[PDB]
Amino acid sequence: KLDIKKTFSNRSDRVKGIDFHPTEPWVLTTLYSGRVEIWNYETQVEVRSIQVTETPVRAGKFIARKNWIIVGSDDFRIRVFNYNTGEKVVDFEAHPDYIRSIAVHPTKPYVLSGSDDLTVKLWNWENNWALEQTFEGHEHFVMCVAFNPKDPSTFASGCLDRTVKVWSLGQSTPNFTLTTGQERGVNYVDYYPLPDKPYMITASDDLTIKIWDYQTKSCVATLEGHMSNVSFAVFHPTLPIIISGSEDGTLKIWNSSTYKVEKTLNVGLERSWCIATHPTGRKNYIASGFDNGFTVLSLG
């Protein structure tokens, strides 16, 4: 079934964050050099580039309903830009350490940031980007934050402390803590989007990807095959597959019903760091950022 087309790729400094715009034919990339880029992957032309800082820009997302991008960099700052004009909307120090992950609430004016300072912070853009909650309890770097798309009053944080914590907005203690048995930590967490299964997925430096039932807490499956640290693993929005990427330089596509590998790709850009999927499955697009640039693929 996998009819993969190489839509667009670009060689650059290491790409640490990547995101699809939901309606325009664009990907955002955030680079180790301190630049961020917006590319039109159909025309293969850059829309806009910004020198944000001199430090790596480690995380970035579109906020499409506000005409913004939001980015987090190793100078500890969150910055927001209007992507049509380049105007800087806000610039603040978010944490006293690196920002690993940013998540944008789908219907309320909230952003989450996860950090090496052991916390997740919630910022409200309709309250002047005020800090409104700090979620405390993790015991190592918070590597990834993700709202539950089926209930975005809750979100998951994946941590090098080997746990995922699931939290409710407004509550200081997690709803629960999942101990993953991934002894090298959790680098990534993602929710399965459909209502038939209460599942999430974690990736680790211990070479494993694990699928979890967050109601029963059982490990449903372990996907083995990567040979070095697994940077991410996600459920595709529209195809019954999982995409993972690793410091072994590969992307892997896995069947999300049988949990078997379907294809392994070495796109020739060295280590893979980050992932995005087009949110409504336009062309079943995925994109990944690597040491040496990024690629956009249509999976069929």
PDB file of C-alpha atoms in Angstrom:
ATOM      1  CA  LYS A   1       0.000   0.000   0.000  1.00  0.00           C
ATOM      2  CA  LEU A   2       2.901   2.390   0.667  1.00  0.00           C
ATOM      3  CA  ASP A   3       3.245   4.474  -2.478  1.00  0.00           C
ATOM      4  CA  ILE A   4       5.880   6.864  -1.239  1.00  0.00           C
ATOM      5  CA  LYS A   5       6.631  10.056  -3.178  1.00  0.00           C
ATOM      6  CA  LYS A   6       9.547  12.360  -2.327  1.00  0.00           C
ATOM      7  CA  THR A   7       7.669  15.641  -2.205  1.00  0.00           C
ATOM      8  CA  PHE A   8      10.530  17.899  -1.144  1.00  0.00           C
ATOM      9  CA  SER A   9      13.795  17.762   0.752  1.00  0.00           C
ATOM     10  CA  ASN A  10      16.314  20.397   1.763  1.00  0.00           C
ATOM     11  CA  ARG A  11      19.880  20.227   3.043  1.00  0.00           C
ATOM     12  CA  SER A  12      20.565  22.417   6.054  1.00  0.00           C
ATOM     13  CA  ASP A  13      21.907  22.509   9.552  1.00  0.00           C
ATOM     14  CA  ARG A  14      20.316  20.037  11.921  1.00  0.00           C
ATOM     15  CA  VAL A  15      16.539  20.229  12.052  1.00  0.00           C
ATOM     16  CA  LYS A  16      15.270  19.839  15.614  1.00  0.00           C
ATOM     17  CA  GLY A  17      11.601  20.741  15.177  1.00  0.00           C
ATOM     18  CA  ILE A  18       9.172  20.383  12.290  1.00  0.00           C
ATOM     19  CA  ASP A  19       5.457  21.014  11.784  1.00  0.00           C
ATOM     20  CA  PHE A  20       2.861  21.088   8.986  1.00  0.00           C
ATOM     21  CA  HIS A  21       0.513  24.001   8.424  1.00  0.00           C
ATOM     22  CA  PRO A  22      -3.062  22.620   8.354  1.00  0.00           C
ATOM     23  CA  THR A  23      -4.253  24.544   5.259  1.00  0.00           C
ATOM     24  CA  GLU A  24      -1.312  26.166   3.453  1.00  0.00           C
ATOM     25  CA  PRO A  25       1.242  23.876   1.695  1.00  0.00           C
ATOM     26  CA  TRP A  26       3.937  24.673   4.235  1.00  0.00           C
ATOM     27  CA  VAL A  27       6.295  23.053   6.696  1.00  0.00           C
ATOM     28  CA  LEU A  28       8.032  24.885   9.514  1.00  0.00           C
ATOM     29  CA  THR A  29      11.553  23.780  10.440  1.00  0.00           C
ATOM     30  CA  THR A  30      13.556  24.910  13.468  1.00  0.00           C
ATOM     31  CA  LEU A  31      17.314  24.650  13.108  1.00  0.00           C
ATOM     32  CA  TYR A  32      20.422  24.166  15.221  1.00  0.00           C
ATOM     33  CA  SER A  33      21.815  27.422  13.787  1.00  0.00           C
ATOM     34  CA  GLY A  34      19.100  29.557  15.403  1.00  0.00           C
ATOM     35  CA  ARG A  35      17.145  30.002  12.189  1.00  0.00           C
ATOM     36  CA  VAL A  36      13.611  28.919  11.485  1.00  0.00           C
ATOM     37  CA  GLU A  37      12.285  28.368   7.982  1.00  0.00           C
ATOM     38  CA  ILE A  38       8.864  28.025   6.387  1.00  0.00           C
ATOM     39  CA  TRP A  39       8.932  26.121   3.106  1.00  0.00           C
ATOM     40  CA  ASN A  40       6.259  25.603   0.465  1.00  0.00           C
ATOM     41  CA  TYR A  41       6.778  21.933  -0.319  1.00  0.00           C
ATOM     42  CA  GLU A  42       4.708  22.099  -3.531  1.00  0.00           C
ATOM     43  CA  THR A  43       6.678  24.911  -5.184  1.00  0.00           C
ATOM     44  CA  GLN A  44       9.910  24.003  -3.349  1.00  0.00           C
ATOM     45  CA  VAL A  45      10.468  27.677  -2.487  1.00  0.00           C
ATOM     46  CA  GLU A  46      11.082  29.187   0.932  1.00  0.00           C
ATOM     47  CA  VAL A  47       8.170  31.324   2.175  1.00  0.00           C
ATOM     48  CA  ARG A  48      10.043  33.000   5.029  1.00  0.00           C
ATOM     49  CA  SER A  49      13.212  32.578   7.098  1.00  0.00           C
ATOM     50  CA  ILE A  50      13.931  34.173  10.496  1.00  0.00           C
ATOM     51  CA  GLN A  51      17.201  34.379  12.416  1.00  0.00           C
ATOM     52  CA  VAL A  52      15.554  33.877  15.803  1.00  0.00           C
ATOM     53  CA  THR A  53      18.660  33.542  17.966  1.00  0.00           C
ATOM     54  CA  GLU A  54      22.217  32.231  17.812  1.00  0.00           C
ATOM     55  CA  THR A  55      21.363  29.095  19.853  1.00  0.00           C
ATOM     56  CA  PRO A  56      19.496  26.051  18.530  1.00  0.00           C
ATOM     57  CA  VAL A  57      15.762  26.415  18.063  1.00  0.00           C
ATOM     58  CA  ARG A  58      14.711  23.093  19.536  1.00  0.00           C
ATOM     59  CA  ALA A  59      10.907  23.184  19.205  1.00  0.00           C
ATOM     60  CA  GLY A  60       8.380  24.901  17.010  1.00  0.00           C
ATOM     61  CA  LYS A  61       4.700  24.786  16.069  1.00  0.00           C
ATOM     62  CA  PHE A  62       2.239  26.641  13.933  1.00  0.00           C
ATOM     63  CA  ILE A  63      -0.679  28.308  15.676  1.00  0.00           C
ATOM     64  CA  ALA A  64      -2.653  28.520  12.460  1.00  0.00           C
ATOM     65  CA  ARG A  65      -5.788  30.149  13.886  1.00  0.00           C
ATOM     66  CA  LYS A  66      -3.604  33.086  15.034  1.00  0.00           C
ATOM     67  CA  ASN A  67      -1.277  33.379  12.003  1.00  0.00           C
ATOM     68  CA  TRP A  68       1.643  32.572  14.319  1.00  0.00           C
ATOM     69  CA  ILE A  69       4.562  30.303  14.809  1.00  0.00           C
ATOM     70  CA  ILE A  70       5.763  29.617  18.359  1.00  0.00           C
ATOM     71  CA  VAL A  71       9.347  28.483  18.912  1.00  0.00           C
ATOM     72  CA  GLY A  72      11.530  27.542  21.843  1.00  0.00           C
ATOM     73  CA  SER A  73      15.301  27.824  21.897  1.00  0.00           C
ATOM     74  CA  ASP A  74      18.308  26.840  23.980  1.00  0.00           C
ATOM     75  CA  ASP A  75      18.643  30.431  25.261  1.00  0.00           C
ATOM     76  CA  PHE A  76      15.602  29.359  27.350  1.00  0.00           C
ATOM     77  CA  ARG A  77      13.172  31.629  25.488  1.00  0.00           C
ATOM     78  CA  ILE A  78       9.839  31.241  23.813  1.00  0.00           C
ATOM     79  CA  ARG A  79       9.233  33.568  20.898  1.00  0.00           C
ATOM     80  CA  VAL A  80       6.125  33.981  18.759  1.00  0.00           C
ATOM     81  CA  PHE A  81       6.144  35.455  15.246  1.00  0.00           C
ATOM     82  CA  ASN A  82       3.449  36.388  12.787  1.00  0.00           C
ATOM     83  CA  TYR A  83       4.373  34.167   9.858  1.00  0.00           C
ATOM     84  CA  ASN A  84       3.016  36.594   7.271  1.00  0.00           C
ATOM     85  CA  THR A  85       4.991  39.653   8.349  1.00  0.00           C
ATOM     86  CA  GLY A  86       7.789  38.218  10.444  1.00  0.00           C
ATOM     87  CA  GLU A  87       6.774  40.484  13.331  1.00  0.00           C
ATOM     88  CA  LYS A  88       7.812  39.236  16.752  1.00  0.00           C
ATOM     89  CA  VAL A  89       4.641  39.052  18.856  1.00  0.00           C
ATOM     90  CA  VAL A  90       6.237  38.074  22.182  1.00  0.00           C
ATOM     91  CA  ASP A  91       9.627  37.064  23.535  1.00  0.00           C
ATOM     92  CA  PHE A  92       9.979  35.730  27.089  1.00  0.00           C
ATOM     93  CA  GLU A  93      12.104  33.443  29.194  1.00  0.00           C
ATOM     94  CA  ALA A  94      10.035  30.303  29.637  1.00  0.00           C
ATOM     95  CA  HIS A  95      12.282  28.110  31.778  1.00  0.00           C
ATOM     96  CA  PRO A  96      15.774  28.214  33.352  1.00  0.00           C
ATOM     97  CA  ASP A  97      16.872  25.337  31.071  1.00  0.00           C
ATOM     98  CA  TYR A  98      16.285  23.920  27.605  1.00  0.00           C
ATOM     99  CA  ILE A  99      12.830  23.750  26.061  1.00  0.00           C
ATOM    100  CA  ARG A 100      12.291  20.287  24.598  1.00  0.00           C
ATOM    101  CA  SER A 101       8.694  20.359  23.380  1.00  0.00           C
ATOM    102  CA  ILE A 102       5.799  22.740  22.741  1.00  0.00           C
ATOM    103  CA  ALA A 103       2.131  21.756  22.367  1.00  0.00           C
ATOM    104  CA  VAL A 104      -0.736  24.004  21.288  1.00  0.00           C
ATOM    105  CA  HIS A 105      -4.248  23.468  22.630  1.00  0.00           C
ATOM    106  CA  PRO A 106      -6.727  23.014  19.740  1.00  0.00           C
ATOM    107  CA  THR A 107      -9.540  25.234  21.042  1.00  0.00           C
ATOM    108  CA  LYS A 108      -8.293  27.283  24.032  1.00  0.00           C
ATOM    109  CA  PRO A 109      -5.461  29.858  24.011  1.00  0.00           C
ATOM    110  CA  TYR A 110      -2.980  27.629  25.835  1.00  0.00           C
ATOM    111  CA  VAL A 111       0.496  26.429  25.019  1.00  0.00           C
ATOM    112  CA  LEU A 112       2.497  23.875  26.966  1.00  0.00           C
ATOM    113  CA  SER A 113       6.279  23.799  27.171  1.00  0.00           C
ATOM    114  CA  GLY A 114       8.280  20.863  28.559  1.00  0.00           C
ATOM    115  CA  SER A 115      11.776  21.469  29.842  1.00  0.00           C
ATOM    116  CA  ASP A 116      15.004  20.165  31.264  1.00  0.00           C
ATOM    117  CA  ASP A 117      13.975  22.102  34.407  1.00  0.00           C
ATOM    118  CA  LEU A 118      11.778  19.020  35.210  1.00  0.00           C
ATOM    119  CA  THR A 119       8.489  20.856  34.552  1.00  0.00           C
ATOM    120  CA  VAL A 120       5.723  21.497  32.086  1.00  0.00           C
ATOM    121  CA  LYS A 121       4.460  25.089  31.935  1.00  0.00           C
ATOM    122  CA  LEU A 122       1.158  26.382  30.599  1.00  0.00           C
ATOM    123  CA  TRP A 123       1.071  29.851  29.001  1.00  0.00           C
ATOM    124  CA  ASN A 124      -2.150  31.682  28.090  1.00  0.00           C
ATOM    125  CA  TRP A 125      -1.955  33.948  25.047  1.00  0.00           C
ATOM    126  CA  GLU A 126      -5.293  35.627  25.901  1.00  0.00           C
ATOM    127  CA  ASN A 127      -3.727  36.612  29.217  1.00  0.00           C
ATOM    128  CA  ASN A 128      -0.669  38.232  27.701  1.00  0.00           C
ATOM    129  CA  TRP A 129       1.313  34.966  27.659  1.00  0.00           C
ATOM    130  CA  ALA A 130       1.091  34.703  31.444  1.00  0.00           C
ATOM    131  CA  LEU A 131       2.323  31.529  33.108  1.00  0.00           C
ATOM    132  CA  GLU A 132      -0.815  29.968  34.558  1.00  0.00           C
ATOM    133  CA  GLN A 133       0.353  26.556  35.766  1.00  0.00           C
ATOM    134  CA  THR A 134       3.593  24.662  36.364  1.00  0.00           C
ATOM    135  CA  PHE A 135       3.134  20.892  36.432  1.00  0.00           C
ATOM    136  CA  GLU A 136       5.661  19.421  38.850  1.00  0.00           C
ATOM    137  CA  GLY A 137       6.463  15.841  39.730  1.00  0.00           C
ATOM    138  CA  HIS A 138       8.812  14.527  37.078  1.00  0.00           C
ATOM    139  CA  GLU A 139      12.363  13.740  38.220  1.00  0.00           C
ATOM    140  CA  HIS A 140      14.285  14.287  34.989  1.00  0.00           C
ATOM    141  CA  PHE A 141      14.081  16.244  31.739  1.00  0.00           C
ATOM    142  CA  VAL A 142      10.605  16.499  30.215  1.00  0.00           C
ATOM    143  CA  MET A 143      11.205  15.462  26.611  1.00  0.00           C
ATOM    144  CA  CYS A 144       7.766  15.630  25.010  1.00  0.00           C
ATOM    145  CA  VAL A 145       4.301  17.011  25.749  1.00  0.00           C
ATOM    146  CA  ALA A 146       1.089  16.114  23.919  1.00  0.00           C
ATOM    147  CA  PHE A 147      -2.553  16.986  24.479  1.00  0.00           C
ATOM    148  CA  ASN A 148      -5.013  14.102  24.289  1.00  0.00           C
ATOM    149  CA  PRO A 149      -6.908  15.026  21.092  1.00  0.00           C
ATOM    150  CA  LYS A 150      -9.984  13.222  22.370  1.00  0.00           C
ATOM    151  CA  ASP A 151      -9.883  15.243  25.633  1.00  0.00           C
ATOM    152  CA  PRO A 152      -7.522  18.226  25.538  1.00  0.00           C
ATOM    153  CA  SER A 153      -8.298  19.095  29.115  1.00  0.00           C
ATOM    154  CA  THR A 154      -5.654  16.400  29.644  1.00  0.00           C
ATOM    155  CA  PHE A 155      -2.154  15.954  28.289  1.00  0.00           C
ATOM    156  CA  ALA A 156       0.760  13.545  28.576  1.00  0.00           C
ATOM    157  CA  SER A 157       4.406  14.290  29.367  1.00  0.00           C
ATOM    158  CA  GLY A 158       7.198  11.855  28.532  1.00  0.00           C
ATOM    159  CA  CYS A 159      10.312  12.078  30.675  1.00  0.00           C
ATOM    160  CA  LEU A 160      13.844  10.749  31.085  1.00  0.00           C
ATOM    161  CA  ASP A 161      12.652   9.588  34.533  1.00  0.00           C
ATOM    162  CA  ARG A 162      11.152   6.607  32.662  1.00  0.00           C
ATOM    163  CA  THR A 163       7.537   7.703  33.135  1.00  0.00           C
ATOM    164  CA  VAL A 164       4.667   9.272  31.269  1.00  0.00           C
ATOM    165  CA  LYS A 165       2.486  11.453  33.452  1.00  0.00           C
ATOM    166  CA  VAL A 166      -1.057  12.323  32.376  1.00  0.00           C
ATOM    167  CA  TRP A 167      -2.372  15.570  33.821  1.00  0.00           C
ATOM    168  CA  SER A 168      -5.600  17.573  33.961  1.00  0.00           C
ATOM    169  CA  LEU A 169      -5.456  21.306  33.397  1.00  0.00           C
ATOM    170  CA  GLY A 170      -6.017  23.008  36.749  1.00  0.00           C
ATOM    171  CA  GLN A 171      -4.865  19.999  38.823  1.00  0.00           C
ATOM    172  CA  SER A 172      -1.436  19.875  40.432  1.00  0.00           C
ATOM    173  CA  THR A 173      -1.100  16.123  40.825  1.00  0.00           C
ATOM    174  CA  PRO A 174      -1.059  13.875  37.746  1.00  0.00           C
ATOM    175  CA  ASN A 175      -4.137  11.828  37.049  1.00  0.00           C
ATOM    176  CA  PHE A 176      -1.709   8.907  36.864  1.00  0.00           C
ATOM    177  CA  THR A 177       1.908   7.989  36.234  1.00  0.00           C
ATOM    178  CA  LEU A 178       2.780   5.220  33.755  1.00  0.00           C
ATOM    179  CA  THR A 179       6.079   3.463  34.516  1.00  0.00           C
ATOM    180  CA  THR A 180       7.340   2.344  31.155  1.00  0.00           C
ATOM    181  CA  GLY A 181      10.184  -0.038  31.928  1.00  0.00           C
ATOM    182  CA  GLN A 182      12.172   1.950  29.321  1.00  0.00           C
ATOM    183  CA  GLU A 183      15.143   2.303  31.602  1.00  0.00           C
ATOM    184  CA  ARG A 184      16.983   4.868  29.475  1.00  0.00           C
ATOM    185  CA  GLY A 185      13.959   7.194  29.686  1.00  0.00           C
ATOM    186  CA  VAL A 186      11.071   8.305  27.484  1.00  0.00           C
ATOM    187  CA  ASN A 187      11.956  10.655  24.607  1.00  0.00           C
ATOM    188  CA  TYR A 188       8.514  10.943  23.034  1.00  0.00           C
ATOM    189  CA  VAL A 189       4.825  10.331  23.676  1.00  0.00           C
ATOM    190  CA  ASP A 190       1.912  10.444  21.225  1.00  0.00           C
ATOM    191  CA  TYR A 191      -1.796   9.623  21.462  1.00  0.00           C
ATOM    192  CA  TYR A 192      -3.697   7.345  19.117  1.00  0.00           C
ATOM    193  CA  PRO A 193      -6.339   9.676  17.667  1.00  0.00           C
ATOM    194  CA  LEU A 194      -9.381   7.451  17.160  1.00  0.00           C
ATOM    195  CA  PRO A 195     -11.972   6.664  19.847  1.00  0.00           C
ATOM    196  CA  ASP A 196     -11.844   2.866  19.595  1.00  0.00           C
ATOM    197  CA  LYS A 197      -8.634   2.453  21.631  1.00  0.00           C
ATOM    198  CA  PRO A 198      -7.313   4.488  24.610  1.00  0.00           C
ATOM    199  CA  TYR A 199      -3.728   4.089  23.423  1.00  0.00           C
ATOM    200  CA  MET A 200      -0.496   6.065  23.485  1.00  0.00           C
ATOM    201  CA  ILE A 201       3.020   5.294  22.298  1.00  0.00           C
ATOM    202  CA  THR A 202       6.477   5.948  23.780  1.00  0.00           C
ATOM    203  CA  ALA A 203       9.977   5.910  22.301  1.00  0.00           C
ATOM    204  CA  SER A 204      13.247   5.463  24.217  1.00  0.00           C
ATOM    205  CA  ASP A 205      17.028   5.441  24.074  1.00  0.00           C
ATOM    206  CA  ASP A 206      16.686   1.786  25.139  1.00  0.00           C
ATOM    207  CA  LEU A 207      15.865   1.012  21.457  1.00  0.00           C
ATOM    208  CA  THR A 208      12.193   0.233  22.068  1.00  0.00           C
ATOM    209  CA  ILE A 209       8.857   1.708  21.101  1.00  0.00           C
ATOM    210  CA  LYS A 210       5.948   0.717  23.351  1.00  0.00           C
ATOM    211  CA  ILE A 211       2.206   0.973  22.817  1.00  0.00           C
ATOM    212  CA  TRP A 212       0.209   1.505  26.012  1.00  0.00           C
ATOM    213  CA  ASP A 213      -3.439   1.279  27.004  1.00  0.00           C
ATOM    214  CA  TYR A 214      -3.713   4.311  29.276  1.00  0.00           C
ATOM    215  CA  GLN A 215      -6.885   2.967  30.918  1.00  0.00           C
ATOM    216  CA  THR A 216      -5.533  -0.464  31.871  1.00  0.00           C
ATOM    217  CA  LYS A 217      -1.859   0.684  31.850  1.00  0.00           C
ATOM    218  CA  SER A 218      -0.891  -2.489  30.002  1.00  0.00           C
ATOM    219  CA  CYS A 219       1.864  -2.518  27.423  1.00  0.00           C
ATOM    220  CA  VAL A 220      -0.067  -3.663  24.358  1.00  0.00           C
ATOM    221  CA  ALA A 221       3.019  -4.160  22.188  1.00  0.00           C
ATOM    222  CA  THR A 222       6.732  -3.469  21.939  1.00  0.00           C
ATOM    223  CA  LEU A 223       8.121  -2.542  18.515  1.00  0.00           C
ATOM    224  CA  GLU A 224      11.729  -3.669  18.285  1.00  0.00           C
ATOM    225  CA  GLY A 225      14.104  -3.076  15.422  1.00  0.00           C
ATOM    226  CA  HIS A 226      15.854   0.254  15.733  1.00  0.00           C
ATOM    227  CA  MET A 227      19.587  -0.017  16.414  1.00  0.00           C
ATOM    228  CA  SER A 228      20.171   3.297  18.225  1.00  0.00           C
ATOM    229  CA  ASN A 229      18.188   5.839  20.251  1.00  0.00           C
ATOM    230  CA  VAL A 230      14.593   6.176  19.092  1.00  0.00           C
ATOM    231  CA  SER A 231      13.908   9.901  18.738  1.00  0.00           C
ATOM    232  CA  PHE A 232      10.145   9.675  18.168  1.00  0.00           C
ATOM    233  CA  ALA A 233       7.230   7.409  17.332  1.00  0.00           C
ATOM    234  CA  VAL A 234       3.799   8.638  16.268  1.00  0.00           C
ATOM    235  CA  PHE A 235       0.483   7.300  15.057  1.00  0.00           C
ATOM    236  CA  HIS A 236      -0.361   8.545  11.577  1.00  0.00           C
ATOM    237  CA  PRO A 237      -3.590  10.597  11.555  1.00  0.00           C
ATOM    238  CA  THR A 238      -5.296   8.797   8.681  1.00  0.00           C
ATOM    239  CA  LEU A 239      -3.417   5.571   7.889  1.00  0.00           C
ATOM    240  CA  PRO A 240      -3.208   2.579  10.285  1.00  0.00           C
ATOM    241  CA  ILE A 241       0.548   2.947  10.672  1.00  0.00           C
ATOM    242  CA  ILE A 242       3.137   4.237  13.129  1.00  0.00           C
ATOM    243  CA  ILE A 243       6.188   6.246  12.049  1.00  0.00           C
ATOM    244  CA  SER A 244       9.393   6.203  14.061  1.00  0.00           C
ATOM    245  CA  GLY A 245      12.856   7.655  13.588  1.00  0.00           C
ATOM    246  CA  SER A 246      16.217   7.104  15.189  1.00  0.00           C
ATOM    247  CA  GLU A 247      19.835   8.070  15.588  1.00  0.00           C
ATOM    248  CA  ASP A 248      20.426   4.920  13.503  1.00  0.00           C
ATOM    249  CA  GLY A 249      19.518   7.237  10.608  1.00  0.00           C
ATOM    250  CA  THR A 250      16.333   5.398   9.657  1.00  0.00           C
ATOM    251  CA  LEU A 251      12.644   6.036   9.572  1.00  0.00           C
ATOM    252  CA  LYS A 252      10.490   2.988  10.137  1.00  0.00           C
ATOM    253  CA  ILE A 253       6.845   2.535   9.153  1.00  0.00           C
ATOM    254  CA  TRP A 254       4.992  -0.013  11.260  1.00  0.00           C
ATOM    255  CA  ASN A 255       1.539  -1.554  10.920  1.00  0.00           C
ATOM    256  CA  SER A 256      -0.516  -0.273  13.850  1.00  0.00           C
ATOM    257  CA  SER A 257      -2.836  -3.303  13.837  1.00  0.00           C
ATOM    258  CA  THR A 258      -0.273  -6.118  13.700  1.00  0.00           C
ATOM    259  CA  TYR A 259       2.679  -4.140  15.150  1.00  0.00           C
ATOM    260  CA  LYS A 260       5.013  -5.456  12.460  1.00  0.00           C
ATOM    261  CA  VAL A 261       7.486  -3.369  10.520  1.00  0.00           C
ATOM    262  CA  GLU A 262       6.405  -2.491   6.987  1.00  0.00           C
ATOM    263  CA  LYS A 263       9.350  -0.504   5.672  1.00  0.00           C
ATOM    264  CA  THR A 264      12.662   0.988   6.783  1.00  0.00           C
ATOM    265  CA  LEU A 265      14.054   4.077   5.011  1.00  0.00           C
ATOM    266  CA  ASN A 266      17.492   5.680   5.102  1.00  0.00           C
ATOM    267  CA  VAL A 267      16.824   9.025   3.452  1.00  0.00           C
ATOM    268  CA  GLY A 268      20.517   9.901   3.530  1.00  0.00           C
ATOM    269  CA  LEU A 269      20.498  12.779   6.025  1.00  0.00           C
ATOM    270  CA  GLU A 270      22.182  10.960   8.970  1.00  0.00           C
ATOM    271  CA  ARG A 271      20.450  10.966  12.390  1.00  0.00           C
ATOM    272  CA  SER A 272      16.673  11.538  12.556  1.00  0.00           C
ATOM    273  CA  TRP A 273      15.484  13.894  15.317  1.00  0.00           C
ATOM    274  CA  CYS A 274      11.920  15.044  14.739  1.00  0.00           C
ATOM    275  CA  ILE A 275       8.635  14.226  13.045  1.00  0.00           C
ATOM    276  CA  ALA A 276       5.413  15.799  11.892  1.00  0.00           C
ATOM    277  CA  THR A 277       2.345  14.514  10.061  1.00  0.00           C
ATOM    278  CA  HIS A 278      -0.093  16.588   8.061  1.00  0.00           C
ATOM    279  CA  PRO A 279      -2.930  16.925  10.575  1.00  0.00           C
ATOM    280  CA  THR A 280      -5.831  15.968   8.263  1.00  0.00           C
ATOM    281  CA  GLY A 281      -3.819  13.510   6.192  1.00  0.00           C
ATOM    282  CA  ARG A 282      -3.416  15.648   3.076  1.00  0.00           C
ATOM    283  CA  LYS A 283      -1.460  13.353   0.715  1.00  0.00           C
ATOM    284  CA  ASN A 284      -0.792  11.301   3.854  1.00  0.00           C
ATOM    285  CA  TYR A 285       2.199  13.627   4.243  1.00  0.00           C
ATOM    286  CA  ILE A 286       4.887  13.088   6.838  1.00  0.00           C
ATOM    287  CA  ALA A 287       8.064  15.093   7.371  1.00  0.00           C
ATOM    288  CA  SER A 288      11.181  14.417   9.417  1.00  0.00           C
ATOM    289  CA  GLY A 289      14.163  16.531  10.395  1.00  0.00           C
ATOM    290  CA  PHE A 290      17.676  15.169  10.533  1.00  0.00           C
ATOM    291  CA  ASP A 291      21.308  16.120  11.101  1.00  0.00           C
ATOM    292  CA  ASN A 292      21.632  17.265   7.472  1.00  0.00           C
ATOM    293  CA  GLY A 293      18.205  18.697   6.623  1.00  0.00           C
ATOM    294  CA  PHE A 294      14.621  17.534   6.260  1.00  0.00           C
ATOM    295  CA  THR A 295      12.365  15.558   3.957  1.00  0.00           C
ATOM    296  CA  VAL A 296       8.637  15.676   3.171  1.00  0.00           C
ATOM    297  CA  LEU A 297       7.137  12.391   1.941  1.00  0.00           C
ATOM    298  CA  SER A 298       3.653  11.571   0.683  1.00  0.00           C
ATOM    299  CA  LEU A 299       2.990   8.020   1.839  1.00  0.00           C
ATOM    300  CA  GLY A 300       0.344   7.166  -0.718  1.00  0.00           C
TER     301      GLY A 300
END
